[PDB]
């Protein structure tokens, strides 16, 4: 596990860092229907909404 995911460049990095209101994980499953959804930094130290694609 933890080997499949999908970055969502079409998402505000602000809402991601929002530990109080992470609309990222909620957004992913909303449309993408990912597993849980989470935000993480990229090669360029850019926090993006990375969704999980593997299960239902």
Domains, the chain: 1-56 (3.30.30.10)
Cβ-contact 27, 39 below 8 angstroms: no
Q: Phi first, then psi: what are they for 41, rounded to 5°? A: -75, 155
Method: NMR
3-state SS assignment for residue 26: helix
Q: What torsion do the CA atoms of 56, 9, 23, 19 make, to the nearest 10 degrees? A: 110
Cβ-contact 4, 53 below 8 angstroms: yes
- In angstroms, the CA 11 to CA 46 distance is 11
Residue ranges of alpha helices (H) inside 1-56 are: 13-17, 23-30
Beta partners for residue 39, in sequence order: 49
């Amino acid at each position: 596990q933890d080997k499949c995911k999908k970055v969502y460049e079409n998402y505000p990095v602000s809402k991601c860092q929002l530990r109080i209101a992470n609309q990222c994980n909620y957004d992913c499953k909303l449309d993408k229907h990912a597993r849980s959804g989470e935000c993480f930094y990229d090669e360029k130290r850019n926090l993006q909404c990375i969704c999980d694609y593997c299960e239902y």
